[PDB]
Amino acid sequence: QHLGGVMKPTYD
Amino acid sequence: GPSCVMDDFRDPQRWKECAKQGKMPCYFDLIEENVYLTEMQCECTPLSKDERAQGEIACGEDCLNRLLMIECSSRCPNGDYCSNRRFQRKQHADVEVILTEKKGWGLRAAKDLPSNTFVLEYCGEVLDHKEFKARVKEYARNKNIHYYFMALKNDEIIDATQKGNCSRFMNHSCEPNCETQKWTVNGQLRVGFFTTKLVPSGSELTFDYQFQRYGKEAQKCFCGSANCRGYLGGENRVSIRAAGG
Numbered sequence: 001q002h003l004g005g006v007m008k009p010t011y012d
Numbered sequence: 013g014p015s016c017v018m019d020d021f022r023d024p025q026r027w028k029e030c031a032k033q034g035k036m037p038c039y040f041d042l043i044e045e046n047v048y049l050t051e052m053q054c055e056c057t058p059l060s061k062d063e064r065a066q067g068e069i070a071c072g073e074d075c076l077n078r079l080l081m082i083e084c085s086s087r088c089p090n091g092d093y094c095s096n097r098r099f100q101r102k103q104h105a106d107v108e109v110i111l112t113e114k115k116g117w118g119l120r121a122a123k124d125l126p127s128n129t130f131v132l133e134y135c136g137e138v139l140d141h142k143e144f145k146a147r148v149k150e151y152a153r154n155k156n157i158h159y160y161f162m163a164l165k166n167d168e169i170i171d172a173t174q175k176g177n178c179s180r181f182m183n184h185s186c187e188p189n190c191e192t193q194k195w196t197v198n199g200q201l202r203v204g205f206f207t208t209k210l211v212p213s214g215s216e217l218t219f220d221y222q223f224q225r226y227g228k229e230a231q232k233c234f235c236g237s238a239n240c241r242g243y244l245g246g247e248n249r250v251s252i253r254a255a256g257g
């Protein structure tokens with residue numbers, strides 16, 4: 001769709 | 013811009029009236045621990061009474077649980093004095109919610125925060141891939157501007173859109189002062205925000221979203237940093253399927 005996404009934590 | 017302390021979010025009636033006047037952010041269900049949409053000790057030597065009176069740290073920098081990013085339990089050899097139960101005891105940094113010029117609401121330090129200080133846990137509803145797609149479809153139909161999805165682990169996305177805490181206000185920066193740290197508490201993985209440097213009082217708290225964009229259009233970045241990447245999500249768009257873990 002128009003906008004959107006997912007935040008990804010730093011590799012831990 | 014207007015500001016509000018974390019005590020202001022405990023009264024739902026007063027908050028909902030402040031939201032009508034734009035003095036507080038829009039209403040959401042305040043939670044203190046993740047809610048799933050579909051349902052040994054360390055080897056630290058206990059501190060003596062003299063060591064605690066001096067100010068020494070129980071399960072400090074050397075703790076074996078602290079090293080595997082695992083919090084201690086109530087059975088810790090340091091008992092109540094264990095400093096490695098921050099998520100469980102809600103030992104949060106003093107923060108306030110503020111209205112930014114162009115990013116919506118944000119978070120700011122209410123006191124000077126040393127480097128590697130636990131800010132808040134990123135709480136919300138934990139979704140599997142089908143539930144995540146369901147929320148993606150709903151938010152696309154609603155024409156939402158803000159997104160609150162945080163990848164936790166395979167087939168686990170935290171969605172703080174409807175339920176969460178003030179960590180859902182942390183904005184993105186291309187030169188941030190916080191980072192996530194994924195901690196295990198009672199065998200369950202949790203995401204928390206931690207300062208990465210000394211953050212002076214009144215400064216906005218930010219982290220690098222490392223945003224995985226499924227949207228057709230990318231959101232322009234207003235972080236104002238000299239190294240700004242210009243957008244949240246970079247150049248490449250991924251599918252809804254791939255963004256969710």
Ligand SMILES: C[S@@+](CC[C@H](N)C(=O)[O-])C[C@H]1O[C@@H](n2cnc3c(N)ncnc32)[C@H](O)[C@@H]1O
Pocket residue numbers: 037114115116117118157158159160180181182183184185231232233234235
């Ligand atoms: C996790 S919410 C953060 C809280 C949000 N600012 C609010 O008012 O509820 C993420 C949304 O904030 C906005 N945002 C965060 N960081 C931004 C930035 N550096 N530049 C532009 N918008 C930003 C975007 O609309 C993004 O989808």
Ligand SMILES: [Zn+2]
Pocket residue numbers: 054055056070071072075076077078084096
């Ligand atoms: Zn320990």
Ligand SMILES: [Zn+2]
Pocket residue numbers: 054056070071075084085088089090094095096
């Ligand atoms: Zn401990």
Ligand SMILES: [Zn+2]
Pocket residue numbers: 185186233234235236237239240241242243
């Ligand atoms: Zn930027």
